[PDB]
Write a protein that binds this ligand. Structure first.
Ligand SMILES: CO[C@@H]1C(=O)CC[C@@](C)(O)[C@@]1(O)[C@@]1(C)O[C@@H]1CC=C(C)C
Ligand SMILES: [Co+2]
Ligand SMILES: [Co+2]
Ligand SMILES: [Co+2]
Ligand code: NA
Length: 304
């Protein structure tokens, strides 16, 4: 394998972390290849679930607990801390809230969150690498509670970063919020990519094509598919009671991605940095509820 940048994996990983049996487990948790029977049963559908009031309560709960856990991770971002150490804390924070860490054994994913540094786009595997001053790192939290998943991510700065890093992360957050600000009944899912790419391109950045926002509720991902680039072919129209994520991945260089031999770590093919932010959204009559919002601050952590 030819690495695209400076980052490398830092192995071995610590033994897989157990989740006590009193925590309710998704179906894939105990599948030997981490496949989800419930996902495979709905695989190939484009029907978008309209959530019941029960579903809404379930999504509000798991999304706010997910936020609490991301906030735990945010409080640990400093030079010297390893991404494995963040994952350990995230794992304990999930259990402390009677939640299962959704990534764990998802298609045999080995950890309890995704930690994406610099040229990593998404799905980085927590490992023994200490964060370095100047790094950008995204922590992506997915939790599972009472049958529902919730999903959010932020990119953080590690100590002082360069101006490129500041501009990339700010622009990405702006992309996310502009997209969110357009969500309401009657808008085509395909429109959000036009808004995101417009802002990205205006700032000299590109938009990752191979990963998308997604429906989420009783499945970790389902319809709709929500691409972040312009003139995409996404199917479907927003309606009150839809829940989905928006999670733009923006890049300093070109948009092309490739995957490490681990089968998960997605990286820019050119080795330049990529940043991401993500919320889980519930469409309402007036617009949307941001289920994963920060409750104790108007702003994401990088703005501190
Ligand atoms: C729609 O896919 C999703 C996508 O494109 C955006 C990035 C991911 C990670 O959310 C995604 O790739 C998922 C859901 O397949 C990945 C499996 C999830 C975990 C936490 C390992
Ligand atoms: Co996510
Ligand atoms: Co997501
Ligand atoms: Co899947
Ligand atoms: Na990155």
């Amino acid at each position: 394998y030819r690495y695209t940048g400076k980052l490398r994996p830092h192995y071995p990983l610590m033994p897989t972390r157990p989740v006590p049996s009193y925590i309710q487990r998704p179906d894939y948790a105990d599948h030997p290849l981490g496949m989800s029977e419930s996902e495979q049963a709905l695989k190939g559908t484009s029907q978008i679930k309209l959530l019941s009031s029960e579903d809404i309560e379930g999504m509000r709960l798991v999304c706010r607990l997910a936020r609490e856990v991301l906030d735990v991770a945010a409080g640990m971002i400093k030079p010297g801390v390893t991404t494995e150490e963040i994952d350990h804390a995230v794992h304990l924070a999930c259990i402390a809230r009677n939640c299962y860490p959704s990534p764990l054994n998802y298609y045999n994913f080995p950890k309890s969150c995704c930690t994406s540094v610099n040229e990593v786009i998404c799905h980085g595997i927590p490992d023994r690498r200490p964060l370095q001053e100047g790094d950008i790192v995204n922590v992506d939290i997915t939790l599972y509670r009472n049958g529902y998943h919730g999903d959010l991510n932020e990119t953080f700065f590690v100590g002082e970063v360069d101006d490129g890093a500041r501009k990339l992360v700010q622009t990405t957050y702006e992309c996310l919020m502009q997209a969110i600000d357009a969500v309401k009944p009657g808008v085509r899912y395909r429109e959000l990519g036009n808004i995101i790419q417009k802002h990205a391109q205006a700032n000299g950045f590109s938009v990752v094509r191979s990963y998308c926002g997604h429906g989420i509720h009783k499945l970790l991902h389902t319809a709709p598919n929500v691409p972040h680039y312009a003139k995409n072919k996404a199917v479907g129209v927003m309606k009150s009671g839809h829940v989905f994520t928006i999670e733009p991945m923006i890049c300093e260089g070109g948009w092309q991605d490739e995957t490490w031999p681990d089968g998960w770590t997605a990286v820019t093919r050119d080795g330049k940095r990529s940043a991401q932010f993500e919320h889980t959204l519930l469409v309402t009559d007036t617009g949307c509820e941001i289920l994963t919002r920060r409750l104790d601050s108007a702003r994401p952590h990088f703005m501190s």
